Amino acid sequence: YGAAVVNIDLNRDFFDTATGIDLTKGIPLVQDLLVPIGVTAGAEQSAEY
């Protein structure tokens, strides 16, 4: 009783940090896999999705 919102997430326990995935933002986010060239720093982040 008193749960505000119940969401369906990807399972952090399966998709572990060992997978290089980061599920804290609500989406998988793998750093430095695909990444655009020729863009200003911090423009890479959407690719992390």
Partner 1 sequence: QVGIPKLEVDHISFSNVVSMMTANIRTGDDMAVERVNPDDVRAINIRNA
- How far apart are alpha carbons 40 and 47 in whole angstroms? 13
Residue pair 30/10 in contact (Cβ under 8 Å)? The answer is no
- What tokens were used for 22? 């980061």
CB of residue 40 vs partner 1: minimum separation in angstroms? 7
CB of residue 46 vs partner 1: minimum separation in angstroms? 12
In this chain, which of 19, 27, 43, 45 binds partner 1, going by CB under 8 A?
A: 43
Residues 1-40 touching partner 1, rule: CB under 8 A, are 36-40
- Residues in contact with partner 1 by the rule CB under 8 A: 36-40, 43
